């Protein structure tokens, strides 16, 4: 390792608020959280939604003139999702973000078969 130039942007100062980063979330629905920064300073905020299956997900990031970053993501399947957040290249003291995606209340799904046939003349 190596260092020299003192830091400039503090991550611990930054605050993460939003339903998407709540201790618990809902599947199927699209959550949307935002990063509020007061004295944190200047820096880029990156998000990484990890799935309980072992793969990474897509997380849109939109910066704001108010020094805030709006992010959103969906939960295909329930389980334990891990969200990684960093400010100006610094992992906040809240990362990772332990999130739990639940299906919600008890429900009964219904699926039915759909017949289908190809097209084309016979000429026979």
UniProtKB/Swiss-Prot annotation:
Tissues in which the protein is found: Ubiquitous. Isoform 1 and isoform 2 are expressed in placenta, bone marrow, brain, umbilical vein endothelial cells (HUVEC), retina and skeletal muscle. Isoform 1 is predominantly expressed in prostate, uterus, liver, thyroid, stomach, lymph node, small intestine, spleen, skeletal muscle, kidney, placenta, pancreas, heart, lung, platelets, endothelial cells, megakaryocytic and erythroleukemic cell lines. Isoform 2 is predominantly expressed in spinal cord, platelet and Daudi cells.
Post-translational changes noted in the entry: ISGylation prevents ability to interact with the upstream activators of the JNK cascade and inhibits IFNA-induced JNK signaling.
Filamin repeat start and end residues: 8-101
Superkingdom as given in the UniProt entry: Eukaryota
Medical condition linked: Interaction with FLNA may compensate for dysfunctional FLNA homodimer in the periventricular nodular heterotopia (PVNH) disorder.
Summary of subunit composition and partner proteins: Homodimer. Interacts with MICALL2. Interacts with RFLNA and RFLNB. Isoform 1 interacts with FBLP1, FLNA, FLNC, GP1BA, INPPL1, ITGB1A, PSEN1 and PSEN2. Isoform 3 interacts with ITGB1A, ITGB1D, ITGB3 and ITGB6. Interacts with MYOT and MYOZ1. Interacts with HBV capsid protein. Interacts with ASB2 isoform 1; the interaction targets FLNB for proteasomal degradation.
This protein's name: Filamin-B
Organism, scientific name: Homo sapiens (Human)
Lineage, highest ranks first: Eukaryota, Metazoa, Chordata, Craniata, Vertebrata
Whole sequence portion shown: 1611 to 1721 of 2602
């Amino acid at each position: 390792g190596s260092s020299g130039s003192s830091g400039t942007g503090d991550a611990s100062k930054c605050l993460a608020t939003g339903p998407g980063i709540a201790s618990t979330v809902k599947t199927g629905e699209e959550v949307g959280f935002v990063v509020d920064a007061k004295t944190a300073g200047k820096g880029k905020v990156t998000c990484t939604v990890l799935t309980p299956d072992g793969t990474e997900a897509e997380a849109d990031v939109i910066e704001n003139e108010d020094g805030t970053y709006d992010i959103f993501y969906t939960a295909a399947k329930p389980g334990t999702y891990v969200i990684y957040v960093r400010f100006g290249g610094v992992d906040i003291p809240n990362s990772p973000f332990t999130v739990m995606a639940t299906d919600g209340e008890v429900t009964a799904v219904e699926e039915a078969p759909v017949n289908a046939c190809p097209s084309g003349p016979s000429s026979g």
